[PDB]
């Protein structure tokens, strides 16, 4: 039922930007993580994410190596989650993928999510 | 567990007036920022907010293009922040977010906003 529809990958050089989309769709629930991941050699890790609690409030999370380039948000009207990333290093080249599940013991914890998009590619000359 | 409520939002013409509120909630920590910023299109930029430090003083901050118009406040007995838009203009359009957060390097760095509200409309014909 979930659908994770991502878009927004490309080339780019170092120093440049990109801005990554994940339309949503389906039956979420109300309350839970919406993360990118970055995948590369199997190697995964979490990039950042948003929690949604049922109150309405949500919560941001960046992993160090992109804290300060990367901005991720959501337009909930739109049910669209956006990673804006800057400043782009060649560390940052892979497949990302974006994740959503109601539970995680911890945001980075890839192996709690269960729905996963099909990626976008982002290279980093 | 911070829960951000808000409320207020609604249509006008030019010129005219509204209120927001924002109510908090849960455990914010004694020190930060709390902002209003404006979501159109996404494109997310600060209002006006203010940052209460642990001494209980807190330093109010506004965008440039709000300054002379809108004025922030909070009722910290009634964990309560305000903004009041006078004198509003169709660029004021927007749906508008409340957010916190314990640290960030400056107020408008919405980036480095942790925790966001479920915003309310603001529509200024
Ligand atoms: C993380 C979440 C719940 C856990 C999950 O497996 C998938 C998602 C991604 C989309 C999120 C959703 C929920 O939070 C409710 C959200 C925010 C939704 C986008 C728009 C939304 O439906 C609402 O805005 C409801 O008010
Ligand atoms: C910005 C702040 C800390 C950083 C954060 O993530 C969320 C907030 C918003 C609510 C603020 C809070 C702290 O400043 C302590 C405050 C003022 C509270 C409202 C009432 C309060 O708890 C007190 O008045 C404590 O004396």
């Known amino acids: 039922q979930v659908q994770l529809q991502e878009s927004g990958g490309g080339s780019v050089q170092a120093g440049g930007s990109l801005r990554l989309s994940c339309?949503?769709?389906?039956?979420?629930?109300?309350?839970?993580?919406?993360?990118?991941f970055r995948q590369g050699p199997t190697e995964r890790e979490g990039?950042?994410?948003?929690?949604?609690?049922?109150?309405?409030?949500?919560?941001?999370?960046?992993?160090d190596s992109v804290k300060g380039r990367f901005t991720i948000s959501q337009d909930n009207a739109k049910k669209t989650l956006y990673l804006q990333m800057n400043s782009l290093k060649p560390e940052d080249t892979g497949m990302?993928?974006?994740?959503?599940?109601?539970?995680?013991?911890?945001?980075?914890?890839?192996?709690?999510?269960?729905?996963?998009?099909?990626g976008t590619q982002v290279t980093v000359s | 567990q911070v829960q951000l409520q808000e409320s207020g939002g609604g249509s006008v013409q030019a010129g005219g007036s509204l209120r927001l509120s924002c109510v908090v909630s849960?455990?914010?920590?004694?020190?930060?920022?709390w902002a209003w910023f404006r979501q159109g299109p996404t494109e997310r930029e600060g209002v006006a907010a203010?940052?209460?430090?642990?001494?209980?003083?807190?330093?109010?901050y506004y965008a440039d293009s709000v300054k002379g118009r809108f004025t922030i406040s909070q009722d910290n007995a009634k964990k309560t922040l305000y903004l009041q838009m006078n004198s509003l203009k169709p660029e004021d359009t927007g749906m508008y977010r409340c957010?916190?957060?314990?640290?960030?390097?400056?107020?408008?760095?919405?980036?480095?906003?942790?925790?966001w509200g479920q915003g309310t409309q603001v529509t200024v014909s």
């Open positions: 849960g455990n914010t920590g004694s020190t930060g920022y």
């Open positions: 957010a916190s957060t314990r640290f960030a390097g400056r107020w408008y760095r919405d980036s480095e906003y942790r925790a």
């Open positions: 203010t940052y209460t430090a642990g001494s209980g003083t807190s330093m109010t």
